[PDB]
Design a protein around this ligand. Structure first.
Ligand code: NAG
Ligand code: NAG
Ligand code: NAG
Ligand code: NAG
Ligand code: NAG
Ligand code: NAG
Ligand code: NAG
Lengths: 49, 168, 270, 49
């Protein structure tokens, strides 16, 4: 019966999860973490990724 | 033994380093520093880099498991490679910084609310550890009035009587 | 050493069974708790065909039953059901000769020896033990596996121990990926008499070796009980495949169960 | 500066974001892999021709 509420809550959480998981996507970059690119590639090369 | 240094024996050792396109088998002693807990540090455990606060943990890691991940797929816990102990990693604290201010036409005295931060990481007279965060420059008052400037978590601040900002 | 030649060579016919729901192992070394996590890697699909045979460790009686050379593919799930430790090791490679580098893993009475060399494996690798009546204990005294071993590329010997010379099920997963030979192991007491047991048990990682060689075939190594003159051990083999699995880490982090997504529509929903 | 105005009315304004930087760096590795036998060469009682 409480679904109307619970449902809503889930959606919120769901969105956040998706958002957080979008931190782990390459989007075409060599890696999905900025620190690795900064530590490996020089700014002239790193900036494109 | 009585020959000149030119004719005396000399033991010679030549160290050559064979570097092929194969996994390396010989390396040097890594410089492992001391462990620091309960302080925002830039840590690197066995090549796994990160930034956060290391705290003693009660998690029951299995003997072979090293890191502890979560739904976020971020390292929540680690195993200290030298001393086999489990450390929880917490992201270094942060949060919004809001300013509770009565109208400048009224006064220029303000209070600062660091939302969602404990009153220990604020460099910081009066301090209040409200559930909404650390409030600085606000005088906690037991008396309850009508909400004037809604801070949050049931706490509201107002400019009132010499006058000052009171959080109630 | 010097190979021992057997005039008569034979191999028992293969048999087939169902994998049920075994072959699940921890993909990485990341701890987790009370969480359902999806991982895409080489796993043993549930209810897959499993090719199994028997290993004769005693003759009684001049016929040499030699184990067969089996392909490796992308990895092998090898199970052994036995009372005593009959299965002792394996050999991996492509040509299994001195032409190409070959790996050899063994667990003798002393310790575990893992050597990657240009081995020249014998036709019928032989491990022979004899019963010391005075000492009332078996002692290994024959090891004729490879005729030669040249240009060794890897060697690792574990610490010495004593192996004891209600069944035991020893499951192993061998995966050669990115030049790394990963071995995962599990040991359980199984009361079943015959057939691959039906149940669930995660396989903990054992060791990763950066041998960096090519493997396409492997063969099993058994122990021979020399006697002055029936309960032969059995073993099963399955081939892993690229699959997606939903693993359920419980409070302690032990994988309590797993679901094979591509097994059936219900698992796809799960 | 957040509101771009000289006059600020009563209320609470999200001005900035407070973040804590790392005080120092911690590096820990498994302290012993093995121990190369260089002494067997240098401290050998007898050397070869
Ligand atoms: C290296 O780590 C091991 C692991 O417990 C420890 O026993 C040993 O004392 C350590 N050695 C040094 C020099 O700290
Ligand atoms: C300041 O506010 C008071 C009432 O709160 C008002 O009477 C006064 O005119 C205001 N001053 C200015 C400069 O607007
Ligand atoms: C802030 O830290 C102290 C000690 O670490 C703790 O007792 C207190 O509960 C913390 N603040 C909040 C709001 O939990
Ligand atoms: C508010 O009252 C509580 C008990 O009722 C007391 O402990 C606390 O010190 C009071 N605070 C102030 C600012 O007087
Ligand atoms: C395994 O393969 C054999 C023939 O290759 C077949 O007869 C048998 O039914 C298969 N196993 C299963 C469980 O279908
Ligand atoms: C072993 O290596 C040497 C030099 O790397 C080579 O001359 C020799 O042929 C190799 N062994 C075999 C069996 O080819
Ligand atoms: C976790 O391990 C502890 C100690 O090994 C044991 O007492 C407990 O029952 C275990 N719990 C689960 C859920 O496996």
């Amino acid at each position: 019966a409480l679904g109307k509420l619970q449902d809503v809550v889930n959606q919120n959480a769901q969105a956040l999860n998706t958002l957080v998981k979008q931190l782990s996507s390459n989007f075409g970059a060599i890696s999905s973490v900025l620190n690795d690119i900064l530590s490996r590639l020089d700014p002239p090369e790193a900036e494109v990724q | 033994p009585t020959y000149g240094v030119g004719y005396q024996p000399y033991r010679v050792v030549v160290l050559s380093f064979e570097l092929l396109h194969a996994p390396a088998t010989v390396c040097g002693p890594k410089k492992s520093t001391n462990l620091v807990k309960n302080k925002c540090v830039n840590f690197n455990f066995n090549g796994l880099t990160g930034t956060g606060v290391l705290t003693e943990s009660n998690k029951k890691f299995l003997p072979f498991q090293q890191f502890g991940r979560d739904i976020a797929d971020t390292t929540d816990a680690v195993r200290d490679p030298q001393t086999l102990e489990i450390l929880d990693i917490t992201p270094c604290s942060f949060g919004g910084v809001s300013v509770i201010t009565p109208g400048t036409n009224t006064s220029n005295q303000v209070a600062v609310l660091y939302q969602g931060v404990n009153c220990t990481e604020v460099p910081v007279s009066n301090v209040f550890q409200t559930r909404a965060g650390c409030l600085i420059g606000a005088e906690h008052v037991n008396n309850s009035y009508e909400c004037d400037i809604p801070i949050g978590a049931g706490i509201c601040a107002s400019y009132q009587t010499s006058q000052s900002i009171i959080a109630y | 050493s010097q190979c021992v030649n057997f005039t008569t060579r034979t191999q028992l016919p293969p048999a087939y069974t169902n994998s049920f729901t075994r072959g699940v192992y921890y993909p990485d070394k990341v701890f987790r708790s009370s969480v359902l996590h999806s991982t895409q890697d080489l796993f043993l699909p549930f209810f897959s065909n499993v090719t199994w045979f028997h290993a004769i460790h005693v003759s009684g009686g001049t016929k040499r039953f030699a184990n067969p050379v089996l392909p490796f593919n992308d990895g092998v799930y090898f199970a052994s059901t036995e009372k005593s430790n009959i299965i002792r090791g394996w050999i991996f490679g492509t040509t299994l000769d001195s032409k190409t580098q070959s790996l050899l893993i063994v667990n003798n009475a002393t310790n575990v020896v893992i050597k990657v060399c240009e081995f020249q494996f014998c036709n019928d690798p032989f491990l022979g033990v004899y019963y010391h009546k005075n000492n009332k204990s078996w002692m290994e005294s024959e090891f004729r596996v490879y005729s030669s071993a040249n240009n060794c590329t890897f060697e690792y010997v574990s610490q010495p121990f004593l192996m004891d010379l209600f069944k035991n099920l020893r499951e192993f997963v061998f995966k050669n990926i990115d030049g790394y030979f990963k071995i995962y192991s599990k040991h359980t007491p199984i009361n079943l008499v015959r057939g691959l047991p039906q149940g669930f048990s995660a396989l903990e990682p054992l060791v990763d070796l950066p041998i960096g060689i090519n493997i396409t075939r492997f063969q099993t190594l058994h122990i021979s009980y020399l006697t002055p003159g029936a309960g032969a051990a059995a073993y099963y083999v399955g081939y892993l495949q690229p699959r997606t699995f939903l693993l359920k880490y419980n409070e302690n982090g032990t994988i309590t169960d797993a679901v094979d997504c591509a097994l059936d529509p219900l698992s796809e929903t799960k | 500066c957040t509101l771009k105005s000289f006059t600020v009315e009563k209320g609470i304004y999200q001005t900035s974001n407070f973040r804590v930087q790392p005080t120092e760096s911690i590096v820990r590795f498994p302290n012993i892999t093995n121990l190369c036998p260089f002494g067997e060469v240098f401290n050998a009682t007898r050397f070869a021709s």
